[PDB]
A and B are shown apart, each in its own frame.
Chain A
Amino acid sequence: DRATWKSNYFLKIIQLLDDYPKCFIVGADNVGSKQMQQIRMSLRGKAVVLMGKNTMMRKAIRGHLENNPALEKLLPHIRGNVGFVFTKEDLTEIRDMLLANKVPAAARAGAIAPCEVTVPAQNTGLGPEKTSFFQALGITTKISRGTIEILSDVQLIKTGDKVGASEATLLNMLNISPFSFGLIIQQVFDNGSIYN
Chain B
Amino acid sequence: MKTILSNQTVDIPENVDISLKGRTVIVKGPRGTLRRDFNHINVELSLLGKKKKRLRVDKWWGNRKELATVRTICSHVQNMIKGVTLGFRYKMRSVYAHFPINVVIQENGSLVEIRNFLGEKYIRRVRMRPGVACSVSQAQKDELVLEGNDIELVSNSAALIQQATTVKNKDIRKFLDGIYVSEKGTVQQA
Is chain B in direct contact with chain A in the complex (CB below 8 A)? no
**Residues of A bordering B, CB below 8 Å:** none
